[PDB]
Ligand SMILES: *[C@@H]1O[C@H](CO)[C@@H](OC2O[C@H](CO)[C@@H](O)[C@H](O)[C@H]2NC(C)=O)[C@H](O)[C@H]1NC(C)=O
């Protein structure tokens with residue numbers, strides 16, 4: 001099942 | 014004729030058949046207008062005989078296991094306004110004869126095994142509104158030019174396909190299209206400027222392709238635009254100023270591209286912007302103050318760019334901000350205290366900048382802040398006592414700054430704090446006993462500071478997993494109460510003034526994988542207890558101390574130890590106790606008083622001869 005629309009995963013330190 | 018699931022026309026003939034949400038298996042009245050067999054777990058092919066129901070208008074076979082091709086006879090049904098084949102096993106091409114269904118409105122092919130190209134025939138469907146073919150990995154080829162002829166399209170999605178090439182300029186003819194979703198595909202070349210002709214466009218999702226060129230300026234003339242996801246492409250050039258002209262734009266994600274230039278001041282006019290993600294680009298300039306006029310902003314991720322200047326104080330105006338990521342930039346100046354007027358902040362990451370000054374006390378007044386990451390900056394001054402106020406703080410990283418003074422005791426007030434890294438600063442005095450109050454604390458990194466005084470078991474929480482106190486001035490003895498932390502995976506005390514024996518209580522740290530005691534004043538004999546910790550696996554470093562006596566026989570029991578360094582001590586006797594450790598990878602015995610022969614084995618043969626030369630009697634011998 002293809003993934004629904006999403007934003008760029010945020011990345012913190 | 015009504016039992017259930019069967020409906021008749023007025024004239025008395027069977028009209029509609031519907032069955033769903035049952036459980037079944039296996040393969041599957043010429044007046045029937047509507048046929049739904051859906052979610053039936055059906056297998057096999059679609060019988061070509063389907064094409065014989067001439068009055069068919071709806072056909073929904075979706076959410077089954079059907080295989081084989083889509084029979085071309087299916088396209089004989091000239092009365093079909095809905096065809097749902099989605100979520101099946103279907104393979105093959107979309108037949109050209111698709112163009113013959115002249116009244117088709119809805120077409121759902123998504124989540125299948127389909128391959129080939131999209132026929133140039135789709136252009137003959139004048140009533141087509143929704144076409145969703147995504148989630149077919151081998152659907153390939155360029156989007157056909159003829160797509161511009163479907164005048165009624167609202168929804169188009171090809172996501173997670175192998176669709177390649179540039180989107181045709183044809184796309185600008187779709188004057189009613191609302192959502193274009195083609196993401197996680199093979200697209201390359203520039204977004205065509207003609208896309209600015211699609212007046213109803215609301216949502217543009219092109220992310221995770223190879224799209225190159227720049228973001229067309231024409232995109233600012235789309236007045237209904239709401240969400241723009243262009244993330245993870247090759248996009249180049251500056252962000253169009255004209256985007257400030259899209260009153261409805263609530264989400265902008267350009268993350269992971271090549272964009273340069275400046276964040277445009279015009280963004281200040283977007284009164285609906287909730288989320289701005291520019292992360293991982295080349296954007297230069299300063300954060301423009303006009304950005305503080307977007308009152309609904311929850312998410313600002315500008316990390317990994319070239320942004321210079323100071324963080325604007327008018328940031329207090331964004332009262333809904335949950336997340337602020339500016340890390341890996343050129344930011345300078347003080348962190349503004351007014352940032353604490355954003356009461357909802359969950360996560361602040363400012364790491365890897367030039368920020369200077371003290372950490373403003375007010376930021377610790379945030380009752381919802383889980384993550385505070387200020388690492389790698391020029392920050393100096395004390396850690397404020399107000400740190401005790403930040404009730405929900407989970408992850409705290411202040412490492413890589415100039416911070417001075419003692420660790421404030423009120424940090425013991427924080428019951429959710431999991432992870433704390435203060436390493437590489439100027440901290441002084443003792444580790445505060447009150448830190449025993451962080452009941453959740455699993456990771457404590459204090460390394461490379463001026464920390465001083467003694468070290469107690471009562472001083473530390475028993476939930477600790479990771480401890481690094483290395484590179485300090487810590488002194489007196491490693492307390493017996495160290496045996497109280499039974500969760501401790503990794504303990505690094507290296508490069509201190511520590512002294513006395515290693516307490517036998519160390520034997521009760523049952524989880525200890527890594528132990529670094531290197532570079533201290535430890536003396537006496539390595540206790541037998543150290544060999545009783547089967548978990549010792551990653552590393553054991555006893556080097557650069559005063560240890561004497563012999564390697565304890567119990568050391569034969571560390572069957573998992575990969576790295577062992579006893580070097581630069583007064584150790585004596587031979588190595589025989591070590592000879593059977595099969596997982597021992599690295600061994601450093603140099604600068605000791607060892608003597609005796611070692612077997613000729615690839616292990617001992619790999620030991621540098623200078624290592625044997627710094628001992629008393631060590632040599633490789635050959636067995637008789
Ligand atoms: C952290 O919590 C402190 C304890 O209440 C708080 O303290 C004071 O500020 C109030 C005014 O708001 C003063 O009337 C009071 O004298 C202060 N209390 C003490 C004992 O120092 C801090 O202001 C809080 N810090 C932050 C940044 O919110």
Ligand SMILES: *[C@@H]1O[C@H](CO)[C@@H](O)[C@H](O)[C@H]1NC(C)=O
Pocket residue numbers: 507508531532554556557576577578
């Ligand atoms: C053991 O400790 C010494 C002293 O701190 C250090 O220089 C050495 O590299 C450490 N050994 C290993 C194997 O990393």
Ligand SMILES: *[C@@H]1O[C@H](CO)[C@@H](O)[C@H](O)[C@H]1NC(C)=O
Pocket residue numbers: 556557578580581599600601
């Ligand atoms: C002992 O040898 C290991 C492996 O060669 C090395 O990493 C470590 O630096 C050495 N210890 C010291 C004190 O130099």
